[PDB]
User: Fold this.
Amino acid sequence: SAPRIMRLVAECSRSGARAGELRLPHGTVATPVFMPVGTQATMKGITTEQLDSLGCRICLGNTYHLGLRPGPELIRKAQGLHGFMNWPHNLLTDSGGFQMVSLFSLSEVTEEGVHFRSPYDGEETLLSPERSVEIQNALGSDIIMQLDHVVSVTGPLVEEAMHRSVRWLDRCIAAHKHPDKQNLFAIIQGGLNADLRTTCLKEMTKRDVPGFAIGGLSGGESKAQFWKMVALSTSMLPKDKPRYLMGVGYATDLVVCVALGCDMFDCVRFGSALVPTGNLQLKKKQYAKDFSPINPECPCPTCQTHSRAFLHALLHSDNTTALHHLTVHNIAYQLQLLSAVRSSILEQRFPDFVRNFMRTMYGDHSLCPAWAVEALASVGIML
Amino acid sequence: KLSLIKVVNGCRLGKIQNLGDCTVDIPGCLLYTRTGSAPHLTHQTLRNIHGVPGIAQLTLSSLAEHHEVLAEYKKGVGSFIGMPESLFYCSLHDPVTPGPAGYVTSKSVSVWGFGGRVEMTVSKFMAIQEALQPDWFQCLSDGEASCSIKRARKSVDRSLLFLDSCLRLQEESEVLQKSVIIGVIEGGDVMEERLRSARETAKRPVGGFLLDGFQGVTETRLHLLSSVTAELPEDKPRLICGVSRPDEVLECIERGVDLFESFFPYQVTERGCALTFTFDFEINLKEKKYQEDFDPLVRGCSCYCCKNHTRAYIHHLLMTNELLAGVLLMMHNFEHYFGFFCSIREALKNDTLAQLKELICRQM
Ligand SMILES: [Zn+2]
Ligand SMILES: [Zn+2]
Assistant:
């Protein structure tokens, strides 16, 4: 068996909540962890020093966009993504096959790999599993994801895509020559079909990869089906390896999914500022003369320096500047939430944290989302 | 209190003290801001820049439309924008986006920010200043004479009328008691009116003088400039607006001007360029030659951009229109420009300003 990259420092007695540590080449990451997209922070003017100061120790790179600009050859010459973008902490990249790829740019998937279309009936480009690993090797990220056959969808395509994802997993494993330097994660498929997802869990966990992600959720599915597939997945993924739930980032979803056993999360301008009661829409007139910060107890640079009134004025009169300040605060909120979740698990008070979180966000138990009450009850957390 | 260290070849080296614990070096520049922010920079990233000036420039044109909120806030614009301990000079116009001309009358002057025209009579102007409460503020003035002896004569009389009316209203304002009015020299390109503006404004108890209307920069206006500063008292600071390029700055310093706007490094940033001129000219980071260039913008530069990032990365950020490109270019361009002003003062100390001038000109 390969060396494990995670250790558990605490577990909740009743629920599935885990507090862990990931030993990655650019530093240890505490879990559970929310992973912002680095290039989304740089698009909004956030420097490495600023993102580091918020507590971020791992962020995402989108391989498709990186592969367009600046392209893998330039990143290789720059000694990897860490060197190119001056980021000293950990990076996670996807396969480059589907995330943030428009369906207008995709032809049909074949066994050889993913096929990209070029404008105006131009020639197509193949991204094989092997080429996906080679590209992520050049990026030098600390965690790399397998190429999978992603579908949105009912009928035989779901089963077909699930089994192709298993075959592509094996090809990514065979192509990945340096597991000492980068950690390849498999991605569980099967959609909302309990039987297909069970098969995918059973088969993919036969591969000794250092971590597992949970794909194919965060679609249009019901919340009932969503949490049941998350719980099915965590019930069958190894306890001694990380569980990465892709595309889940709303605060309530995050807290419930931690309670179900997930360790890592990601999720992708209207003036909204995240707060424990939900969000503030700072464009509203009521904030024009509100001289308090977004949150007096937020430690972010925006809340130490700026009032709601000032941000409201800038959202109208200097919008780009406002968007920097709000993005900083919103990333800070996500990191603080996960930091507070992890502290509660270490102090063995996670059920109390959930109850306080839900009461602050919604109020009485009868105002909480029904799916969340049920999902939490399934792991022994009553509101 | 302005105290001169020395004056060599008409260039004034000194400090302005009791601003009442703050000091400002002259010759020097003011930190340029737009809508109450240094462009693209935060409190945190501003703190990292070396040599940030001791006084920041605010523009009435970008703040006047926020009068209602600032008046409700009551504690002044510095506190409102989150810089409660900084010194602020409030000018009338923004030097980069000055708005349309032709709206000055004997009764009011107009400015434009993001939205609609803000027309300011003397009382409205002073009401706005009572909400802003800047440390220094340019008096309401007619700067559009050179934009005809008749037109230039009116700019002096209108500006003297505004000055006297504003001083009277300041005498009755509790909050503006700790603020300093800056008199404004007008007269356009008529020598007789420039001298009259200079002599008459100096009779009023202003804290300093703004040399208005010298934007370009002709040798004719440089001669008007020195003719004007010869009439002004030596113990008060001389500000100038619309003059920020390094060569022009040096010409004005030789003619008794002390304080300059720093909008030039902002203009460089907005066109995707980085200042590279030696001071002991610019490069366009969108050029394909930088796509693989892993050198910093300026070798040996101490700014956060150059110590930690490459030309290749900034090139990429510009091509994808990321705000981080403007952050890193602005940090470097301000750091470079403030370092230039440090080198001017060092050259004055060492009596080598003529040599520094030729070094700058050489790269122009
Ligand atoms: Zn905040
Ligand atoms: Zn630099």
In short: The longest helix of chain B spans residues 323-350. Residues 58 and 204 of chain B are 24 Å apart (CA to CA).
